[model samples]
Target: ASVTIRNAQTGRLLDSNYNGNVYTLPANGGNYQRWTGPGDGTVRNAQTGRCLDSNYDGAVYTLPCNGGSYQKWLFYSNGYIQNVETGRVLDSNYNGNVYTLPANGGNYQKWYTG
Candidate 1:
């Protein structure tokens, strides 16, 4: 099933459109805001066929779903989505930007999927 992932701090929904860039937007039930993943599986853009990836630079973006470790993710019960390769969690800057940062359990690093 598809779900919407929201930043706990900003209350924004994760979005990745034609640019294949990841960001956040006000929750309006857009298809771009829907995500597909299992609790212990990879998270993918339901509309774009892209996977959330953590680059070597520690930045995160939407990349073609290639089954790479950087594309694999774990959705923690505590509302953290962590990149399998970098140990960084999905984060929101609280000013609309989204990225990956060390798992510190801060509000910015947590997400709720529904």
Candidate 2:
């Protein structure tokens, strides 16, 4: 099922739309803010059908589902979504920008999916 991803630090929901943008915002419970992961290391936007993708530069974007390493993600028990290719975890600050950084156990680096 599609789920909402929230930032532990900002308490904002992961949001997205066209333009390959992925960020955090106040939860509106909209489709654009819902995600579905197949449990095979990939999470997709239910709104755009794009995969959560990241780069070594630490930017996060949504792109066509390609099953690439950059698109593969692992959800940790501590609420981190880590990129298989970059070894960086999904991060969001109180400002709500979504990016990636090394796993540091900060609240800014943690996420909740429900």
Candidate 3:
């Protein structure tokens, strides 16, 4: 049930800081970088008990689990993390911060779920 989500372009693992903001970090196998969730459920923080959320503004962050649609996601076989409600894909910017962008199969929109 433990997996690390990494950026395809930079090979950095997705991590949430104390403030729940997401960023990419070198894959270190740390608990903060681990995620546990169903194939079509919430992506939860293994260390913080928060769920990955695609907020109204398109920013991605970890927030207290509420089972909201914004908190649910699907990791597609094609490597997109699709927001269940918005149908947008989680994407990392050049600065390493995360947000939701329209799914266009861009490199930043693809993630390696390991």
Candidate 4:
């Protein structure tokens, strides 16, 4: 099958519309999506379907491909691509320390088009 949402940076397959982190009608081929990044709890390798780890730490993270929020894609109007979430895009400042967006255009916001 063809890749629907590819990593704009590496030209690697980030996800297909059928199994992307978020699904939108015609865009993601879904009615409504609940995610906007990688799929539900999946950390599949970019080049292989192998599983990656949280403690990868870049050094020991040595696999042919590693994935996480770091692998998330950021597409710009100029057709540029980046992974802005890799290091500090979602730094938490509260007790729960969870990371998410406010839909009000924060530095963590991501956008995709069909």
* lDDT by candidate, in order shown: 0.81, 0.89, 0.86, 0.30
Give lDDT tens digits, candidate 2, residues 71-107.
9998888898899999999998777788999988789
lDDT of 4: 0.30
Give candidates' CA RMSD values in order: 1.6, 0.9, 1.4, 13.5
**Candidate 3 off by > 4 Å:** 38-40
TM-score attained by model 3: 0.92
Q: Rank the candidates by TM-score, best first.
A: 2, 3, 1, 4
Q: Give the best candidate by lDDT.
A: 2
lDDT by residue (1-114, candidate 4, tens digit) is 112333222322222222222111223433232223254333333333432222213211212235555544454564333334443221122121213332333422332323
TM-score of 1: 0.91
Question: How should the candidates be ordered by lDDT, best one leading?
Answer: 2, 3, 1, 4
For TM-score, the strongest prediction is 2
Off by over 4 Å in 2: none
Pairs clashing within candidate 2: none
